[PDB]
Amino acid sequence: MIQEQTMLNVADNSGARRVMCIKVLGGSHRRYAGVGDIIKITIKEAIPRGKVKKGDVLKAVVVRTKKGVRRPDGSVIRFDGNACVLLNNNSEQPIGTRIFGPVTRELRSEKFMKIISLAPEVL
Amino acid sequence: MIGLVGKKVGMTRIFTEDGVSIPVTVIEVEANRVTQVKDLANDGYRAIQVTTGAKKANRVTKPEAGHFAKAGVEAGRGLWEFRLAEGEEFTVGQSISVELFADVKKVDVTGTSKGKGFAGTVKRWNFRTQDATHGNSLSHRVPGSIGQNQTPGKVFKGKKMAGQMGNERVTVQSLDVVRVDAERNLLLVKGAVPGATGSDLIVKPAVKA
Amino acid sequence: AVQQNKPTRSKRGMRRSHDALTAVTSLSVDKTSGEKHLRHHITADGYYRGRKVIAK
Amino acid sequence: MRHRKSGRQLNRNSSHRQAMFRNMAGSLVRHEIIKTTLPKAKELRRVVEPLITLAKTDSVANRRLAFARTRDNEIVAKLFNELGPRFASRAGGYTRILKCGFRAGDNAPMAYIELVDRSEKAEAA
Amino acid sequence: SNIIKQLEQEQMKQDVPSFRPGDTVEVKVWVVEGSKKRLQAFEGVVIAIRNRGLHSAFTVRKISNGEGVERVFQTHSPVVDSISVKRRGAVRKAKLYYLRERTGKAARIKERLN
RNA sequence: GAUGUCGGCUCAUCACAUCCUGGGGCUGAAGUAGGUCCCAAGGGUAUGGCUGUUCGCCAUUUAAAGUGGUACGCGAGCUGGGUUUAGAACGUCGUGAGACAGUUCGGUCCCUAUCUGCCGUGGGCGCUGGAGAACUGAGGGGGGCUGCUCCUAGUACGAGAGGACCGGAGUGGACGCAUCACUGGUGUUCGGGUUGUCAUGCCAAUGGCACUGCCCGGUAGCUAAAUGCGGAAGAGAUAAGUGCUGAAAGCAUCUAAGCACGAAACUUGCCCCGAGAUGAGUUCUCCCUGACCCUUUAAGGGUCCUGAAGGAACGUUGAAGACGACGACGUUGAUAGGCCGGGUGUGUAAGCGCAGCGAUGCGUUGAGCUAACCGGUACUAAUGAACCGUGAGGCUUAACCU
RNA sequence: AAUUCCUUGUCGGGUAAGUUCCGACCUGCACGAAUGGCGUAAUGAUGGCCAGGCUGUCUCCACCCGAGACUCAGUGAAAUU
RNA sequence: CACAGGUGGUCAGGUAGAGAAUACCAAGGCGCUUGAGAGAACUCGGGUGAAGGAACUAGGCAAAAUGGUGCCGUAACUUC
RNA sequence: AGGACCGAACCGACUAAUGUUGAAAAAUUAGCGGAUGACUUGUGGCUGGGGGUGAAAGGCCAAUCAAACCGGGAGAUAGCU
Ligand SMILES: Nc1nc2[nH]cnc2c(=O)[nH]1
Ligand SMILES: [Mg+2]
Ligand SMILES: [Mg+2]
Ligand SMILES: [Mg+2]
Ligand SMILES: [Mg+2]
Ligand SMILES: [Mg+2]
Ligand SMILES: [Mg+2]
Ligand SMILES: [Mg+2]
Ligand SMILES: [Mg+2]
Ligand SMILES: [Mg+2]
Ligand SMILES: [Mg+2]
Ligand SMILES: [Mg+2]
Ligand SMILES: [Mg+2]
Ligand SMILES: [Mg+2]
Ligand SMILES: [Mg+2]
Ligand SMILES: [Mg+2]
Ligand SMILES: [Mg+2]
Ligand SMILES: [Mg+2]
Ligand SMILES: [Mg+2]
Ligand SMILES: [Mg+2]
Ligand SMILES: [Mg+2]
Ligand SMILES: [Mg+2]
Ligand SMILES: [Mg+2]
Ligand SMILES: [Mg+2]
Ligand SMILES: [Mg+2]
Ligand SMILES: [Mg+2]
Ligand SMILES: [Mg+2]
Ligand SMILES: [Mg+2]
Ligand SMILES: [Mg+2]
Ligand SMILES: [Mg+2]
Ligand SMILES: [Mg+2]
Ligand SMILES: [Mg+2]
Ligand SMILES: [Mg+2]
Ligand SMILES: [Mg+2]
Ligand SMILES: [Mg+2]
Ligand SMILES: [Mg+2]
Ligand SMILES: [Mg+2]
Ligand SMILES: [Mg+2]
Ligand SMILES: [Mg+2]
Ligand SMILES: [Mg+2]
Ligand SMILES: [Mg+2]
Ligand SMILES: [Mg+2]
Ligand SMILES: [Mg+2]
Ligand SMILES: [Mg+2]
Ligand SMILES: [Mg+2]
Ligand SMILES: [Mg+2]
Ligand SMILES: [Mg+2]
Ligand SMILES: [Mg+2]
Ligand SMILES: [Mg+2]
């Protein structure tokens, strides 16, 4: 449950450390982005020699949230923080080559197959 | 197709073999007894009037009692009508069970919604509250403007204002029929239906796809 | 906010058309003491449904 | 809304209500009959009747629990020594409300609330 | 309520082992891993238990790649294949929410040896 | 002898010169995507950075971010940042008091709603004897949005790049209603921990006060962030438009006669109200079967006797409620409280015993306590009774029957 | 610029985006030396701007506790007309 | 006005505390001269709040937050 | 030592909400500044209306001060309503 101004951690090796949600994509007046949703982000903090820089405006897929995901039996999987994976603005494909921390099977799509394969754990 | 009268028992869930939890409303559908058959010749329209449940003899008035006596049925908690289709035919004193819904895929469920009493514009009409701070004076959940000026010089009919919320006839459409069991007097529908536990429900096959 | 026009004695009476009191119609007599009383209430001498329930 | 809720607020806060019913439960145990408003007599049953139920089993723990709810050892002594045995075989309903007048000063509906098998000797002394 | 109770107990698991808050539990869950259907283990501390007949649940907390993961299991769900206590934990509270503010050495729970 | 100014907030309502979605003609329209005009007002129609701003520029969205009217809509609805008071300063002008339609810092926003209007909710009487229900449906209101992916099909089209119509499937955004089973929030009425202090004689155990003293949890209910469902399809008549047959006018011509199509607008279809629909409708059932007197003699007035069905009253009350209303129950009784058993929540009470110098630990013990919950149970309270409402129901004509 | 009309001047910085802010330029409509000029540590319920923490300020409002509002009894106003 | 306003001096118990702050009490004085119910909107005054965390607004207005003692340690600049 | 620091009494009055036919003709509540000094306060005294007093706001001079209040000239005058 991510909105504009939300700060997220980064679940990849793009070089980004802290990103802010500047837009929840996918609809007019669309309020929140959850696990699996694409967001528009600004880089607030980045490592000295990464794939991205502080101030860069791009996209990201949300992979972990404090609100978590519901499963068809009524179950919930929640995370201690909100994390995202940086995506190229046009291709909407990952910038990084490695994924950190667990991800959920909700990413099982043709476009986020790379994220589930790279992830250490899939819940 | 005709519908039946029931009672909202409450909600539970049905767990499936593929790990799905279906939220269900338990509806008690006891036999519905035909108290009157309305035809074109006598009434100008075709329908069945039904009763269900039981009523204390000391609460059944003489006018009520005579109407049940004519049908040859015991007194029920009330009377409800269902319009007949062409080809649909019933008889006075006939019993209709929940099995009517056996091969009915979706139903429309009517109930009297829970009463919220006198409700403000925020609860009743989802009006947005004004500032909690920033100098607001006595005007947080208050409705704001209710009109324009000298043109039109009046508030319009239908203006969203505070008033009685709930405790009214509400129909929830196209609910999936999960289970029918005449032996247990049961109908399980997927999702929530209007009303409180113990209140009467009208169940009819879905009017839409 | 205040009236622009003085309301009438007619109007006053119309407003008051629901103000009349209702006389109690629910008085019973105790079978033992013979005292009048409000239904479901004890009598002045402390009788209720023919029995002396309060010694006052 | 107030849907399925129990307990009268009585234009008081929580700690005042509790203090008052602790006093009023003591008054009824002591005198065996009291005159109060109809809503207060109705609320009182919910405080005094579980006290008599507790007094049906004499133990140090039950006496201490009754003391925590009454803070009067004369009241806990009468509960366990007199009322507990007197009501031993009665399954609830140890009290009775008898509706009476209207209070002169404010037109409040009054009621008498008494212990079902009243001792006129204990009431006088 | 009697009708609901009857509909509920016929769906209730009979073999639920006894576990309590602070215990380390391993839940074996049915998952669809692409085109495959296998059992997946989720081991961690029971931080909450909701005892509610058919609506019973339990919250299991684990540390994955330095960050906390909480899973709320619906006890009577066919998705939950088995539950086994791996370690008995000694705690005073029903709800171990204070463990969310604890990391590594501070989040350790003593073993219940009785 | 006062009609409060800009902008914002809240709440809107109309127009159409239409922003999107829908239909269509022309295109310098291959496709995709556009341009322009016609038809169309059903719904839908961003959040931010800067500034008092409206606007505007900029960032990032969106199917789209419409243009206008409504006292440049809306202060007896809110704000008070801009802007006309009094303080003060700078630049400029003036000898000066002062001045600026220059800038700058600071700077009191009242009104308990009588009438109209509107949102809710009652009381009265009427509908022609009275009464209890179930309805018919005139009329009124609500709703009406849309993305993306997939299949058709890498097809038609195209040198390629790219890439459809028609039709079908799925899944979302926003909006709306309902519900509390799940996930949670709350839960000063449940359980526990703890600080300071005062009391219950003291120990131990408890209680008061300090924001519920401060906290950790949490039942029922309420509830959204939770999870169900909805917008439709279809039908009728159309708009712009496309046509068939066809004269006037030997031909031609969608039109004059005749005929076929055609849109999110319109009428239906869906949801809610609804016979005060005084044009007061229909159906089923229930109840009432005594005399007398008087006058201006008539649909007249009154008296005695009668008092039904039903309604109400009183009481116990409700997931019903401001009050009223509405629903359940009243001993031939589960309506409320209590009581019993369970569940739930808290998390192993007290007392005693053991271990330790002690704090404290261990055992008895998942203990004790447990609201609004579930299943039961007449222990308490729901009294035999009373009040309102009557006593066979107008005239005319017709049709049956006497 | 508490001074600059044109003006949101231009350039740089900060922000995803900055009519304000900070640094710089000089084209000072209309700075300038006790009408004091330019600085200046400390001080300030002083004006402008940025950040961390924090949060119902807001997305967007939910539940709860109290005092009114509502009902009964007693007393009993007002402006206006 | 039996009015939440104003009015100079003196006295200074216990526990905790730096204290005449503050909390609980003693002596002593009081419950404030309409009450009874109910538990709607809305207003006032409070408590708790998922995910987010200034996106609010003219402006963080209001809230929330910080808060004690000891020791360690502490930058530019400075009139030292 | 200090118009030193933090902070009650005491003196003041920066912000907000409430109240605005008020509990109050300027307050209440939560916060705020000074708190050994150009401090604060009691009792009594002196200055008087074109006059006083003023760390200066045209502030204050007995609840409206760019000329107090009361009585008088007085029935000022009013080409105005
Ligand atoms: N006591 C009593 N019981 C009833 N049951 C049905 N009506 C009544 C009534 O009026 N009184
Ligand atoms: Mg009915
Ligand atoms: Mg209700
Ligand atoms: Mg808002
Ligand atoms: Mg005000
Ligand atoms: Mg307010
Ligand atoms: Mg107005
Ligand atoms: Mg008009
Ligand atoms: Mg009161
Ligand atoms: Mg207290
Ligand atoms: Mg208690
Ligand atoms: Mg006038
Ligand atoms: Mg047009
Ligand atoms: Mg043109
Ligand atoms: Mg429109
Ligand atoms: Mg566009
Ligand atoms: Mg205007
Ligand atoms: Mg106002
Ligand atoms: Mg100006
Ligand atoms: Mg000035
Ligand atoms: Mg009709
Ligand atoms: Mg002790
Ligand atoms: Mg109707
Ligand atoms: Mg022990
Ligand atoms: Mg029990
Ligand atoms: Mg007669
Ligand atoms: Mg900013
Ligand atoms: Mg500068
Ligand atoms: Mg009164
Ligand atoms: Mg007084
Ligand atoms: Mg006083
Ligand atoms: Mg003083
Ligand atoms: Mg003090
Ligand atoms: Mg008083
Ligand atoms: Mg209230
Ligand atoms: Mg929060
Ligand atoms: Mg939180
Ligand atoms: Mg933060
Ligand atoms: Mg902003
Ligand atoms: Mg804004
Ligand atoms: Mg502040
Ligand atoms: Mg605070
Ligand atoms: Mg000093
Ligand atoms: Mg103060
Ligand atoms: Mg200070
Ligand atoms: Mg100080
Ligand atoms: Mg003096
Ligand atoms: Mg003269
Ligand atoms: Mg004169």
Coordinates of C-alpha atoms (C1' of nucleotides) in Angstrom, one line a residue, chain F residues 99-274:
Chain F
rA99 C1' 1.3 60.6 -0.4
rC100 C1' 2.1 55.9 -3.9
rA101 C1' -3.2 52.3 -8.7
rG102 C1' 5.2 50.7 -5.5
rU103 C1' 7.2 47.2 -2.2
rU104 C1' 7.9 45.3 3.0
rC105 C1' 6.9 43.0 8.4
rG106 C1' 2.4 42.9 11.9
rG107 C1' -2.7 43.1 12.2
rU108 C1' -10.8 41.0 16.2
rC109 C1' -14.6 37.4 10.2
rC110 C1' -21.1 38.1 15.0
rC111 C1' -26.2 36.0 14.4
rU112 C1' -30.0 30.0 19.4
rA113 C1' -33.7 29.7 11.9
rU114 C1' -40.2 32.5 12.4
rC115 C1' -41.5 32.0 6.7
rU116 C1' -39.9 29.7 1.7
rG117 C1' -36.8 25.8 0.2
rC118 C1' -34.4 21.0 1.2
rC119 C1' -33.2 16.1 3.9
rG120 C1' -35.4 12.8 7.3
rU121 C1' -39.5 11.3 10.5
rG122 C1' -44.3 11.4 13.0
rG123 C1' -49.6 13.0 14.4
rG124 C1' -54.6 14.0 11.9
rC125 C1' -58.5 13.2 8.7
rG126 C1' -60.0 11.2 4.2
rC127 C1' -60.8 7.1 0.5
rU128 C1' -68.6 6.4 2.3
rG129 C1' -70.1 0.4 7.8
rG130 C1' -65.7 -0.8 10.4
rA131 C1' -61.2 -3.8 10.4
rG132 C1' -56.4 -7.0 9.3
rA133 C1' -53.2 -8.2 5.4
rA134 C1' -51.3 -9.2 0.5
rC135 C1' -51.0 -6.4 -3.9
rU136 C1' -51.8 -3.7 -9.0
rG137 C1' -48.4 0.2 -10.7
rA138 C1' -50.1 5.9 -12.6
rG139 C1' -46.1 8.8 -11.0
rG140 C1' -41.1 9.8 -9.0
rG141 C1' -36.0 8.9 -7.8
rG142 C1' -31.3 5.9 -8.5
rG143 C1' -28.0 3.7 -12.0
rG144 C1' -25.6 4.5 -16.9
rC145 C1' -17.7 5.8 -16.8
rU146 C1' -13.6 3.4 -18.6
rG147 C1' -8.0 1.0 -19.2
rC148 C1' -5.0 -3.0 -20.4
rU149 C1' -3.9 -8.1 -22.0
rC150 C1' -5.3 -12.3 -24.7
rC151 C1' -7.9 -15.1 -28.9
rU152 C1' -9.3 -14.0 -33.9
rA153 C1' -4.0 -12.9 -36.1
rG154 C1' 1.5 -11.5 -36.5
rU155 C1' -4.0 -12.4 -40.1
rA156 C1' -6.4 -8.0 -43.7
rC157 C1' -3.1 -3.9 -45.1
rG158 C1' 2.0 -2.9 -46.0
rA159 C1' 8.5 -2.4 -49.9
rG160 C1' 9.4 -2.7 -45.0
rA161 C1' 8.8 -1.0 -40.2
rG162 C1' 4.6 -1.9 -38.2
rG163 C1' -0.4 -3.6 -37.8
rA164 C1' -6.2 -3.6 -37.6
rC165 C1' -12.0 -3.6 -38.5
rC166 C1' -16.1 -7.1 -37.0
rG167 C1' -16.6 -10.6 -33.1
rG168 C1' -15.2 -13.3 -28.5
rA169 C1' -12.5 -14.2 -23.5
rG170 C1' -10.1 -12.4 -19.1
rU171 C1' -8.3 -9.0 -15.6
rG172 C1' -8.0 -3.9 -13.5
rG173 C1' -8.7 1.9 -12.2
rA174 C1' -12.4 5.1 -10.4
rC175 C1' -17.4 5.1 -8.5
rG176 C1' -21.7 2.9 -5.8
rC177 C1' -24.4 -0.5 -2.4
rA178 C1' -24.3 -4.2 1.1
rU179 C1' -21.8 -7.2 4.9
rC180 C1' -18.3 -8.5 9.1
rA181 C1' -17.0 -14.8 7.5
rC182 C1' -11.7 -13.6 6.6
rU183 C1' -7.3 -9.6 7.1
rG184 C1' -7.1 -5.6 10.5
rG185 C1' -8.4 -0.8 13.5
rU186 C1' -11.1 0.3 17.9
rG187 C1' -12.9 -1.8 22.1
rU188 C1' -12.3 4.2 29.5
rU189 C1' -17.8 -2.4 30.4
rC190 C1' -12.4 -8.2 29.7
rG191 C1' -7.5 -10.1 31.5
rG192 C1' -2.7 -8.8 32.7
rG193 C1' 2.2 -5.9 33.8
rU194 C1' 4.1 -1.6 36.0
rU195 C1' 5.7 4.0 38.6
rG196 C1' 4.5 7.5 42.7
rU197 C1' 1.1 7.7 46.9
rC198 C1' -3.1 6.8 50.3
rA199 C1' -6.1 3.4 52.6
rU200 C1' -8.3 -1.6 54.0
rG201 C1' -4.5 -2.8 61.7
rC202 C1' 0.1 -5.4 59.9
rC203 C1' 2.3 -9.6 56.5
rA204 C1' 0.3 -11.4 52.3
rA205 C1' -3.6 -10.0 49.2
rU206 C1' -6.5 -6.0 47.4
rG207 C1' -9.0 -1.1 46.3
rG208 C1' -8.9 4.8 45.4
rC209 C1' -6.2 8.8 42.9
rA210 C1' -2.6 10.5 39.4
rC211 C1' -5.1 11.7 31.1
rU212 C1' -8.2 4.8 31.4
rG213 C1' -1.7 7.2 35.9
rC214 C1' 1.3 4.9 32.2
rC215 C1' 1.4 0.6 29.1
rC216 C1' 0.9 -4.7 26.6
rG217 C1' -3.0 -7.5 24.7
rG218 C1' -8.2 -8.1 23.5
rU219 C1' -14.8 -10.2 23.4
rA220 C1' -19.4 -8.5 21.2
rG221 C1' -20.5 -4.4 18.3
rC222 C1' -19.1 -0.6 15.0
rU223 C1' -16.0 -0.4 11.0
rA224 C1' -12.0 0.0 5.9
rA225 C1' -7.5 -0.6 4.4
rA226 C1' -11.3 -6.1 4.4
rU227 C1' -14.6 -9.2 0.5
rG228 C1' -19.1 -10.0 -2.0
rC229 C1' -22.0 -7.8 -5.8
rG230 C1' -23.3 -3.9 -9.5
rG231 C1' -22.9 -0.4 -14.5
rA232 C1' -24.8 -4.7 -18.8
rA233 C1' -27.1 -7.8 -22.5
rG234 C1' -31.8 -7.5 -25.0
rA235 C1' -36.2 -4.8 -27.0
rG236 C1' -38.8 -0.3 -29.2
rA237 C1' -38.6 4.3 -31.8
rU238 C1' -34.8 7.5 -33.6
rA239 C1' -30.1 11.5 -34.6
rA240 C1' -26.4 12.5 -38.1
rG241 C1' -25.7 9.2 -41.7
rU242 C1' -26.1 4.6 -45.4
rG243 C1' -29.5 2.6 -48.7
rC244 C1' -33.9 -0.2 -51.8
rU245 C1' -38.0 0.6 -55.1
rG246 C1' -39.8 5.4 -57.4
rA247 C1' -42.3 9.4 -60.0
rA248 C1' -42.9 14.7 -60.2
rA249 C1' -38.8 15.8 -64.5
rG250 C1' -39.2 9.3 -70.8
rC251 C1' -33.2 9.9 -67.6
rA252 C1' -31.5 10.7 -62.8
rU253 C1' -33.0 11.1 -57.8
rC254 C1' -32.8 7.7 -50.0
rU255 C1' -38.7 10.6 -50.7
rA256 C1' -43.1 13.1 -53.0
rA257 C1' -46.5 7.5 -52.0
rG258 C1' -44.1 2.8 -50.4
rC259 C1' -39.8 0.1 -47.9
rA260 C1' -34.6 -1.5 -45.1
rC261 C1' -31.0 0.1 -41.7
rG262 C1' -28.7 3.4 -38.0
rA263 C1' -25.6 5.9 -31.5
rA264 C1' -23.3 5.7 -24.5
rA265 C1' -28.8 10.5 -26.0
rC266 C1' -34.9 9.0 -25.8
rU267 C1' -38.9 4.8 -24.2
rU268 C1' -38.2 0.2 -21.9
rG269 C1' -35.2 -3.6 -19.7
rC270 C1' -32.1 -3.3 -13.7
rC271 C1' -32.6 -1.1 -8.4
rC272 C1' -35.6 1.9 -4.6
rC273 C1' -40.0 4.7 -3.2
rG274 C1' -44.9 4.6 -4.7

